Design a protein around this ligand. Structure first.
Ligand code: SAH
Length: 270
């Protein structure tokens, strides 16, 4: 029944990422995935490696052939798009509200020799410039819950997908109804609420996988990485970034209530 509970504007979100990007890159050792890792065992792989696994799982579910056009909704620094573009002859349109991320993503594309397959733009997902029925597939890897009006973005994605087009969504969720923003600033949402918003917009749900048991290593491991780079965060990156950093390192107060969802949905055929 209930959908995504519904905040910062898209410009404000872009600004926050403009500010925090250099810190994330520093922690990661370069432009990085900005999503949780997925582990096969008891947390052995680095979070970067585990994040690449998540990317690969999403690509498996969404890139069904060569020669398709894919919209990466909230593309971060473009690292996941470029990972997939290395080995898939497809066209990815990556959109983000952060001009810092656009610039980094486009440079990375150039450096890697992948700009024939991937391009990046500063575009608000709540208002897409694209015609109806433009894309074979889409990703929203931890982007929908950052939006002021996620339902609006979901309807736009449905609009610009072709009939039968596939959407893959990942998100940090409240694992279960037992026991509103997380201390990191992320909107609190159940996977069940995300599903209901997708359905309500007109998507067919193909699959939901609750993978909370595979991703639980992320917050502790990323916090430890962050803590190494924590000196002078407030003076070097600004107080907003310092507040966010403090929240991540405070993960023991809340992360046990978090889980993770991989959703596959499609625009009805026609
Ligand atoms: N309204 C909006 N329109 C487009 N992108 C948005 C948006 N609100 C937030 N985002 C983007 O969503 C991303 C969240 S971080 C996820 C990044 C990427 N999908 C990854 O997996 O690495 C950021 O790039 C942020 O700028």
């Amino acid at each position: 029944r209930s959908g995504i509970p519904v905040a910062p504007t898209s410009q404000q979100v872009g600004q926050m990422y403009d500010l925090v990007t250099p810190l994330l890159n520093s922690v990661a050792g370069g432009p990085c995935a900005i999503h949780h890792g997925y582990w096969e065992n008891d947390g052995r792989a680095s979070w970067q490696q585990a994040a690449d696994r998540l990317t690969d799982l999403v690509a498996e579910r969404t890139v069904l052939d060569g020669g398709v056009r894919l919209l990466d909704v909230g593309c971060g620094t473009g690292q996941p798009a470029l990972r997939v573009a290395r080995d898939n002859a497809i066209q990815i349109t990556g959109i983000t509200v952060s001009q810092v991320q656009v610039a980094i993503a486009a440079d990375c594309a150039r450096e890697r020799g992948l700009s024939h397959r991937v391009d990046f733009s500063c575009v608000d997902a709540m208002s897409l410039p694209y015609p109806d029925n433009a894309f074979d597939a889409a990703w929203a890897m931890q982007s929908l819950l950052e939006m002021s009006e996620p339902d609006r973005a979901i309807r736009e994605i449905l609009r610009v997908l072709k009939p039968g087009g596939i959407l893959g969504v990942t998100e940090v969720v409240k694992r279960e109804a037992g026991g509103d923003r997380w201390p990191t600033g992320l909107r609190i949402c159940l996977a069940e609420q995300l599903l209901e918003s997708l359905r309500a917009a007109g998507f067919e749900i193909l699959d939901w996988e609750d993978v909370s048991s595979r991703t639980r290593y992320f917050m502790p491991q990323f916090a430890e990485e962050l803590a190494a780079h924590q000196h002078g965060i407030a003076d070097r990156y600004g107080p907003a970034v310092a507040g966010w950093a403090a929240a991540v390192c405070d993960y023991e107060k809340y992360a046990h209530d978090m889980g993770y969802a991989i959703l596959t949905a499609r625009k009805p055929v026609g």
